[PDB]
Amino acid sequence: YVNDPSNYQLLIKNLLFSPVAFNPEQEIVYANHRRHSYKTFHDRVRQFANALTKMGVKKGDTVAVMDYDSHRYLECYFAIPMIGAKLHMINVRLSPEQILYTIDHAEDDIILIHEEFLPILDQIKGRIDTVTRYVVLRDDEECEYERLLEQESTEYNFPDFDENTVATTFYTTGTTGFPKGVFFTHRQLVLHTMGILSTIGTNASQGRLHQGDIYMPITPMFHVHAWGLPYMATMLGVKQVYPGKYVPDVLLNLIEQEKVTFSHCVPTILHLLLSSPKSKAMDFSGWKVVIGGAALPKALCKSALERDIDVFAGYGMSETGPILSIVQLTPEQLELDVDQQAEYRSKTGKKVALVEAYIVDEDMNKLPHDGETAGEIVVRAPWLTPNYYKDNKNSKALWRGGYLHTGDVAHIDDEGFIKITDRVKDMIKISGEWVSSLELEDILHQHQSVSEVAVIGMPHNKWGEVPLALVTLKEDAQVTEKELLGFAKDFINKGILAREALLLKVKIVDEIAKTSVGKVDKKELRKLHL
Amino acid sequence: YVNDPSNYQLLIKNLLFSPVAFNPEQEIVYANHRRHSYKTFHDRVRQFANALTKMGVKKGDTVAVMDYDSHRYLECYFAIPMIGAKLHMINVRLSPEQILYTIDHAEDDIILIHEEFLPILDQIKGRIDTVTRYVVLRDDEECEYERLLEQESTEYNFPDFDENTVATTFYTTGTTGFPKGVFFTHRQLVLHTMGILSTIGTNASQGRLHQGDIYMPITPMFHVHAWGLPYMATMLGVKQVYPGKYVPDVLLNLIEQEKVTFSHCVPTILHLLLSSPKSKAMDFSGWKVVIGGAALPKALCKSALERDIDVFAGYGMSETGPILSIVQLTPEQLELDVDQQAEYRSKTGKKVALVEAYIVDEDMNKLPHDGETAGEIVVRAPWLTPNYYKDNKNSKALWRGGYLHTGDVAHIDDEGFIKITDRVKDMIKISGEWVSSLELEDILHQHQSVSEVAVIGMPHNKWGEVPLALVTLKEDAQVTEKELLGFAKDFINKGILAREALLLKVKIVDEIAKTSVGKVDKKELRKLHL
Amino acid sequence: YVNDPSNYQLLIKNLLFSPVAFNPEQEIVYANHRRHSYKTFHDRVRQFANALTKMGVKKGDTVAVMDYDSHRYLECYFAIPMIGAKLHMINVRLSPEQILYTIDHAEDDIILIHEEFLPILDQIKGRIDTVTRYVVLRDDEECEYERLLEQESTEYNFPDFDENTVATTFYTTGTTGFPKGVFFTHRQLVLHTMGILSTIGTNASQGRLHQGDIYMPITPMFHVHAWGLPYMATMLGVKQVYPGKYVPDVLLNLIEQEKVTFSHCVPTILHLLLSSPKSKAMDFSGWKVVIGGAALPKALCKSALERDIDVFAGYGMSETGPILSIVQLTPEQLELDVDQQAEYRSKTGKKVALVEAYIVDEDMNKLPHDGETAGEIVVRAPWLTPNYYKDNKNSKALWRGGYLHTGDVAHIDDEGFIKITDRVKDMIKISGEWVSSLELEDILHQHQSVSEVAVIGMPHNKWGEVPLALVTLKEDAQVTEKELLGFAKDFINKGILAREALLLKVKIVDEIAKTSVGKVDKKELRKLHL
Numbered sequence A, B, C: 001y002v003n004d005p006s007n008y009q010l011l012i013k014n015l016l017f018s019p020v021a022f023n024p025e026q027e028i029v030y031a032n033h034r035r036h037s038y039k040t041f042h043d044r045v046r047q048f049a050n051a052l053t054k055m056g057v058k059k060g061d062t063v064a065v066m067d068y069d070s071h072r073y074l075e076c077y078f079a080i081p082m083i084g085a086k087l088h089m090i091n092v093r094l095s096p097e098q099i100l101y102t103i104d105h106a107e108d109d110i111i112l113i114h115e116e117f118l119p120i121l122d123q124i125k126g127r128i129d130t131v132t133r134y135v136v137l138r139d140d141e142e143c144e145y146e147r148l149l150e151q152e153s154t155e156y157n158f159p160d161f162d163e164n165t166v167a168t169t170f171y172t173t174g175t176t177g178f179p180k181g182v183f184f185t186h187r188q189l190v191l192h193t194m195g196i197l198s199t200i201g202t203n204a205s206q207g208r209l210h211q212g213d214i215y216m217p218i219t220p221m222f223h224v225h226a227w228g229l230p231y232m233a234t235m236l237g238v239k240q241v242y243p244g245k246y247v248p249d250v251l252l253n254l255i256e257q258e259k260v261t262f263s264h265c266v267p268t269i270l271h272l273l274l275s276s277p278k279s280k281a282m283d284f285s286g287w288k289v290v291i292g293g294a295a296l297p298k299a300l301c302k303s304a305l306e307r308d309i310d311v312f313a314g315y316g317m318s319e320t321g322p323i324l325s326i327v328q329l330t331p332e333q334l335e336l337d338v339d340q341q342a343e344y345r346s347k348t349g350k351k352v353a354l355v356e357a358y359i360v361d362e363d364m365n366k367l368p369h370d371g372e373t374a375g376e377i378v379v380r381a382p383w384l385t386p387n388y389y390k391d392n393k394n395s396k397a398l399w400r401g402g403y404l405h406t407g408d409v410a411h412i413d414d415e416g417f418i419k420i421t422d423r424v425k426d427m428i429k430i431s432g433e434w435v436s437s438l439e440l441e442d443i444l445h446q447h448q449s450v451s452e453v454a455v456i457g458m459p460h461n462k463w464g465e466v467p468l469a470l471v472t473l474k475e476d477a478q479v480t481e482k483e484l485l486g487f488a489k490d491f492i493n494k495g496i497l498a499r500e501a502l503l504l505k506v507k508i509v510d511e512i513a514k515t516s517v518g519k520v521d522k523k524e525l526r527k528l529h530l
């Protein structure tokens, strides 16, 4: 590469070595296992670069990582991209067949796998034809990564290359038959860091990620760059605490002892943290958590607010950087009571800097932003995956019409507040209207003998596709379909046919189809019940 | 241009239309003349684009502006670059010959000139062969810019083009025989906005530019993008107050009435504001001002701190975006008293995000950062001018060795605090050492009968070039050279020959050479006295 | 495409329309279902081209076929490539997961699937995101392919394009974790047809494929172009009989009634044909069959020769066209008795025209052709796949050293007769020698109480990897390991340690691991027993 030093390239090495702030004595904390300074972090990054060069990793190679949230993962976020290699973050919660597919598809040269994921590897190791070295990561002194690092020097001259060099890749399991590979360049990751820092750093009072914060991720680092927060935290020079495997008591103790002020987690993790007995005697004031993985329930947001937590929701996916929207409250909105601002904080949010977002119909016609008209969110941003790796048709569908299709149906307020109703594929189309399949679950979850409600769509002759629904009975509650039909009729404020009670045909089923993640597989339900 | 919508281009139109925050009812205030909303600002930008297209301005054209800090200037910052034209900001404080040279060199198609600068134009209008239209700007209803805008629609589809398209240009008068043209692309300006917002937005407590601030520039908008603050303020959606011609009482009244919280000015303007009688009864709490044009005197910083002003210094030049360094205080540093933190706030500062800065010698060898060793600052940043317009040799010298040469001699602390001593060309070289020419002025300004001290260098046989110095007498003070020599001998803590008093040969001169800006011309002094 | 009519392109349309011979009244026979002439075949090809164009198939598209050996498959061999689309031949004997993987990997636009493979599709249809149309093939009048053809005209102007346009693709399941996609261009298929016709057409007496032959495939058409024989048979204008699903009695009746003279089959099919009661009263004189799928057993060859069948072996794989070697007998070799020429006819064969074949070691050093030294066959030919589709590392290994690696270990006679011992991956390496794992099975299959013998390799300390072996007991035969060890000791003519009986450790196991194809999975045995 001819650098042309006046021609600046946006590289992750500039995030590491040209940060907003750098304190060499600032700590990088890995739970209760390890604790070193930012100077040591910088040295270990150089040592890892040396070790990767010694292992034969060249520019364009793929180094896969199977690890928890650790200092090693943070070092992989930097050293692997900075030497010109693509960092492949393996979703360890995927099935071993899916993990093997992603490894074969990405053609990883070396896999950095934690010793606890070795049972996963043993099922698929024989069918891996592309990995020349396995580095086993451990939290003790026997870690092979640590041994590889300590035999190398802390000096490395990181190359300059094109900013459009692919730095990271990972696979998404969406609505395809196989996981879809999304990838991001150095420029895209640098721009994501800068844009999100400009968006949430410049907050007046609420929801700030600033240089005095203490960062602890509670979303996996094999997900979408952990929502880009490790890069932003490194560029801000803040204290970074990595918890390893997510144990709610361990996370609570880390928050208390390390004084964690900024985190990101999914609603399930936040609920587990808030419901833990250890959290009752915990001072959660000063802890800010953004909820982006799934929709943030208003009740969970209200409970977190009652615990004095600055809780707000964000939006993104594997294809989008991820961050496209974050909930940002005006000073007038922070004067509202807990119930009123729990609605605001649980919203999808407003589009972040440099992101243009529209809601369109099936013909890519932009719909008005009035808070009622709903359509698919389509986005343009500096950190979107241009396509799917080794894919043409799914890639063409993803960028149909000149915009990235998120697959989410939403309405946008006049003020710009996005609110997602449900997915495009999980849409109920009746005659000439589309109704969400998610609010029906909340409507039918209000009974005293309902546990889990799942809504699916199947065709009917006169009314087209109509929604079916699934519930489970309680103890000594042998209520038939008639009782649940009457309960659905007992609600109010419903449109179309009377009160949306003419073809509910609710059915009770003992077994509810759940995926390994924790969300119901709607396509599996469609295949099973039809 | 083939947009390739997945290939995101960093454009100023994305700063306007994809901001961090947008409040359509947020106000853009032009002193006491005009006041409209951000929606009206957006419409006027589209109207200006329509008017420029009607005038024949195409992509690659140059629209020059001769104006004060106004809403019109803010609209020129956006509409002219966004249609693909280069915005030429004319330094109205330059001599008419210099302004004419810059107009001829840039080959401006249309000049937007305020009616108060018409006397300047009348001296050079006949020698302008490249301008096809003059638009006269007025603060009344007779403004030609306003008339051109109101005859156009508020609808415009701004083009997509390459992000390396040149957006802005202006001319610097440094150490060359003619003004030097520096230029910046859309990508560079967008990156400057994002980087400075990430740097100062993410401040914990002190020196924040956030979404709740109220912005009023007090540095000219024909300077280096007004230090990029209009772009950042627009991207943050904050209330923007533009004062027009800088009158200290008008500025103070605007700060009081509009509740200005963020500003940028030079030390002279800050001194004029602090010394004005109207400022005594003014509550300056909540007003943050960054001082970047010249070195911030510690006494002025101390007085501003006594007025409860969050005053801090920044560093930059026409070639560098401008911002390279900003003073950022740790929470421990904010606990110091006024005198201790006046030293910190008056420092050059720490390099901002994405900026790598080094101090080198004449052979481009990097010097240690120890706070004592001094060398020329050399920088790499995403917003540096690649060269000088229509210049080769000065451009080669500017980027010699692969780094941009700032022309400033400085030392850098271990913590990264840069402190500039003086200029490279204004350097005193004796035998084997370099001594600053600026601290000598402060040393010799301590007498009771000295008004202005200027230090210049001229060769001597045994000791090489040695420093001469110039002072003026006071009323009924006919002190000869012997008294001032004794006063210089009366100091302490000086190195080299005894106490740096063997060849001072201080001379009194009635006339002190001052340029139009207000700084002494050292080359003019060299020519006059030798 | 600019044809440049003087610049001849080798296209499959030239195989169809510029053949060696064309009889418009020559018959294309599909078992007992359908029977039409070559003129009707030509018309149906044009009709299929019209139907594919109407369906939206463009140049570069992929049309997948899931069918038996039929006239429809023959028409797919021509019409799909000739319009510029890639014909994807789906191995219907693969597991539904593997078939789904290949469909997703090839990104097929339309699948032509026989109604009997619909149960396979129903398991994987939901996970196919790339197929826009399914055409169901039937042997009755309700076939959707027939209906699509009869609504189109028999006129089509087939395009001229580059001869390096990919015409066919299919997936190989070898020693990789996923099926490997090999592809071939129009030029490669035309050259394969010409080369094999020049090789076996120019035979003096034995093993001829000439213009008077009657062709019936007994190898699947989803395999390697059915060994290219449909193309050669069409180019020769000979009567082509397609049997559909392989039923031995149906195949025998077709051979008798249609007077089939040339066929190709695997040893299993030949054994089923020879052992069928219906074949005893069958005149097999004039029937020539080439055996290429697996090694031809000498006993099966001897039995076929006793049935007066011109039986000879060929060699090839999915990557190689397939044909690389065919057994060709000199007139002196045809004077030998049945036993002597059964050895010759069951050999791998001599390399066909335009094929250069070498045996090399692990360092790609060519070994002498002496009939004893064994190494991996490496080939260069005009019809080799250049790489694997969407694969880099496996593709690099396949063409390592500048030659295609077949994965087969063989020795070559001085006369050029290749004889394959076993596979490269199925190699037993002891100290400094390599011994085949296939002749040991025949050695240990000579007992009166052994059914199936499989030899696998596992490490030992002193002697390196050593061979283990697996057998099953017979009725009222409770022989222990000692008896089988004594039987192995009872043989003769063995090298190394005494008589290759010191660490046999033969073990009996009730369950023998067999894949769906019929061959033992050696890697599965390695995983299970270790």
Ligand SMILES: CCOC(=O)CCCCCC(=O)O
Pocket: A223, A224, A227, A264, A290, A291, A292, A293, A294, A313, A314, A315, A316, A317, A318, A322, A323, A324, A325, A326
């Ligand atoms: C503002 C932060 O919130 C986000 O970016 C949400 C990203 C979720 C991506 C999908 C997943 O990992 O499940």
Ligand SMILES: CCOC(=O)CCCCCC(=O)O
Pocket: B223, B224, B227, B264, B290, B291, B292, B293, B294, B313, B314, B315, B316, B317, B318, B322, B323, B324, B325, B326
């Ligand atoms: C951090 C803000 O301070 C600056 O960027 C200083 C820029 C001064 C440029 C030279 C001039 O206009 O006189």
Ligand SMILES: CCOC(=O)CCCCCC(=O)O
Pocket: C223, C224, C227, C264, C290, C291, C292, C293, C294, C313, C314, C315, C316, C317, C318, C322, C323, C324, C325, C326
């Ligand atoms: C001369 C004809 O013999 C061949 O070409 C053998 C080809 C076998 C390919 C592998 C398979 O399909 O199992």
